[PDB]
């Protein structure tokens, strides 16, 4: 692996799990978002954090109650290395089913040395392979639960949000887990040589995010969907702090200037 990768203080920085919504927990740290679904037949797993991150993992699924190795599958967002670096210590440990967009199968089985931006120069993360190729629409069953992804690609080829219902004493709840289409630096919306298309798919992720459609969302970063504004450690069960139309609007719209700017440089 790439010795000296960056790691924001934020990304490492622990906090108090938590139930967001019916059988969805937080299990992340500060900044990166780790969602963990518990069923009857076993666990779906959304994202790690980087290297590391399946010790605070396994320690905050001990404090809510459950067992790290009832994890039965692993799902990310996108196969950069703050989402998927210890995602290989979690499937040797669990032997959970690691399921993936096949747009990002190869960038998941090469540790990210394929990288559009930040490959060439090896490994940023230990390599996975793919026990389930999914497509746009694909649904991901266990125990009751019904997670559909759809395809958002962009900040990688194979970037996924996931959409599934989640019910609590009161009412059911549509979820988002949205992948949010930022775009780097050095990235040329007219074409990038490992990712030609990568211009087409901001525009195309842009338009389709918009016209989703659910009660509450997160996503992979707590600025993204500011987690600490709606949220504090020991706050009341209130899956309504996660109710943010407007907030999601607003954040695809800055998205949708920036592309539309990004594109006349
Ligand atoms: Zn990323
Ligand atoms: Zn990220």
Known sequence: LIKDLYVDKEWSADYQPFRIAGNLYYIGTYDLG??????????????????????????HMKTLGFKFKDIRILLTTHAHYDHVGAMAAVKQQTHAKMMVNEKDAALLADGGNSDYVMGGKGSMFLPVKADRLLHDGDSIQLGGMKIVMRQHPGHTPGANSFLFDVKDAVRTYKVLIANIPSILNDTKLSGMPLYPEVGKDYAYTLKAMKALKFDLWLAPHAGQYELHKKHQPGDAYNPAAFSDRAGYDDVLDEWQQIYDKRVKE
């Open 34 to 59: 780790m969602f963990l679904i518990t069923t009857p037949k076993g666990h779906i797993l959304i994202n790690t954090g980087v290297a590391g991150s399946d010790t605070l993992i396994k320690a």
